[PDB]
Amino acid sequence: GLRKEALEELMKLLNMKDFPYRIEGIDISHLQGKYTVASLVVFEDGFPKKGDYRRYKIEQDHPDDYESIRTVVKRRYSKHPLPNLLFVDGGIGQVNAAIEALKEIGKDCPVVGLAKKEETVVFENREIHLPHDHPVLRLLVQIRDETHRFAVSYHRKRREKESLRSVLDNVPGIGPIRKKKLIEHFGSLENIRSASLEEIARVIGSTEIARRVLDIL
Numbered sequence: 001g002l003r004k005e006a007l008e009e010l011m012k013l014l015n016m017k018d019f020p021y022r023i024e025g026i027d028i029s030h031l032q033g034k035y036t037v038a039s040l041v042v043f044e045d046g047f048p049k050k051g052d053y054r055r056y057k058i059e060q061d062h063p064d065d066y067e068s069i070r071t072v073v074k075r076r077y078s079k080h081p082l083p084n085l086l087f088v089d090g091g092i093g094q095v096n097a098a099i100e101a102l103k104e105i106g107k108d109c110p111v112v113g114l115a116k117k118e119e120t121v122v123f124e125n126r127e128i129h130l131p132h133d134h135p136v137l138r139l140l141v142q143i144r145d146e147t148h149r150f151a152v153s154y155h156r157k158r159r160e161k162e163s164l165r166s167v168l169d170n171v172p173g174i175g176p177i178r179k180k181k182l183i184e185h186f187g188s189l190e191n192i193r194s195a196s197l198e199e200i201a202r203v204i205g206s207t208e209i210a211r212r213v214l215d216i217l
Contacts, residue, residue: 002046006139010085013136014110014123018084021045025087025143026072027151028094030063038072039151042083043143053150065090066097073101082109087140089147091115095122114140160188171209171216178204182213193217 007020023043030036035057042052056072069088082102086109088094095113102109113122121128121140130137161183168179185203186192192200192213201210 002043002139002142003135004046006135007046010112010136010139013121013128014085014112016085016110020085022083023085023087023143024083025089025147026069026098027089027147028063028065028068028072029151029154030065030068032063033061035059036063036065036068037151037154038068039147039154040072040076041143041147041150043146048146055154066093069094069097070101070104073098074105077102077107078105082107085109086111087143087147088113089116089144091118091120091122092125092127096125099124112140114144157187160190164189164192167216168213171212174204174209174212178206178209189217 011020021044025041027039028036029039038056040054040056042049056075058068058071086098088098088111090113095111098111114120115122115127118127119130119132119137121130121136164183164186165179167189168174168182181203182192186195197207197210197214200213201207204210
C-alpha cells in the first residue's frame with residue numbers, strides 16, 4: 001500500500017488542497033500496426049481498486065502518445081468524475097497533454113508525472129528533481145510499478161497461447177491440427193507442464209507424440 005505520510009508529503013509537494021485519497025494512473029503502450037492501449041489503474045486509500053481498472057484503445061498504426069493521452073482523458077472524464085490526483089507514467093509532454101485535455105473539457109484536477117528515465121517528478125510544466133531516497137519519489141515509483149503491471153497483463157492469455165505454440169513448433173512431427181488441440185486444451189506452458197503423459201496423449205490421440213512433447217517441455 002501507499003503510505004499515509006508519503007501521500008501527505010506528495011500533497012504538500014503539489015500544493016494540493018485535498019488529500020490524494022483516490023489516484024488514477026495511466027500507462028500508454030502501443031501495438032505497432034494495431035492500436036495504442038491506455039491502461040488506467042485506481043488507488044483508493046492507498047490500495048489498488050481493481051474493480052475500477054479500465055483500458056482505452058486508440059486505433060492507429062503508429063504511436064502518438066500525447067494525442068493518445070488527450071483522447072483517453074476526454075473519453076474517460078466525459079463519463080467518470082475526476083479523481084483527487086491523476087498520475088501519468090511519463091514526463092512534461094505527457095503531463096501537459098493531460099492538463100490541456102482537462103482544460104478542453106472544462107475540468108480541474110492535479111496531474112503528476114514521473115519522468116521515465118529521470119529521478120524527476122513532473123508537475124505543472126516543471127521537473128522536480130528529488131534525492132533518490134525521497135519518500136515522494138518512492139511513492140510515485142509504487143504507482144508507476146502498478147500501472148506497469150496492469151499494462152503488461154493486457155493480452156496475457158494471447159501471449160501464453162503464443163508462447164506455448166512456439167514451444168510446440170519445436171516438437172518434431174507434431175503437425176498443425178494436434179498443435180492447436182494442445183493449445184486449446186492447455187492454454188499455457190504452465191498447464192501443459194502440470195500434465196501427465198496420458199492426458200497429453202489423449203488430447204492428440206498419440207502417446208508416441210506425447211512423449212516428444214514431454215521431451216521438448
